[PDB]
C-alpha cells in the first residue's frame with residue numbers, strides 16, 4: 001500500500017528530447033515516428049489495491065496497461081509491438097522492461113521535484129520526456 005502515491009494523478013507532457021532517435025532504435029517506422037513524435041500525451045496513473053493502471057491519451061493513440069509489480073504481462077504498444085512487460089519499483093523508480101523478438105527496452109518513471117520524468121532507453125539511445133501535473 002501507498003507504494004506509488006507520488007505517481008498517482010494526471011500528467012501532461014511538457015518537453016521531449018531524443019524521442020525520434022529512441023523510436024528509430026526501437027524499430028518504429030517513419031510514419032508512426034512522425035505522428036507519435038507530434039503527440040502531446042497525458043499520462044494518467046492510478047492505483048487500486050495491488051493493481052496499478054497507466055493510461056496514455058493523445059491524438060495518436062489512447063492506451064492503457066494494468067499490472068501488479070513484478071508480475072509479467074503481455075502488452076501491445078502504441079507502435080503495435082507485441083511485447084512481454086514487467087514493471088517493478090526500484091528505489092522509488094518505476095522500471096518497465098519490454099521484451100520482444102530478442103530485443104529489450106526499458107522505460108523508467110520517476111518523480112523529480114514537481115515533475116514526472118520518463119527515461120526511455122534502447123541500447124545506447126536515451127530519450128527524456130518530462131511531464132507536469134495537468
Ligand SMILES: CC(C)(C)c1cc(C(C)(C)C)c(O)c([C@@](O)(C(=O)O)C(F)(F)F)c1
Pocket residue numbers: 023026028036037039041043056058060061077078079107118120129
Ligand atoms: C504517447 C506516445 C504514443 C507518443 C508514446 C509512444 C511510445 C512508443 C511509440 C511505443 C515508443 C512511447 O514509448 C511513449 C512513452 O514512452 C513516452 O511519453 O515516453 C510513454 F509510454 F511513457 F508514454 C509514448
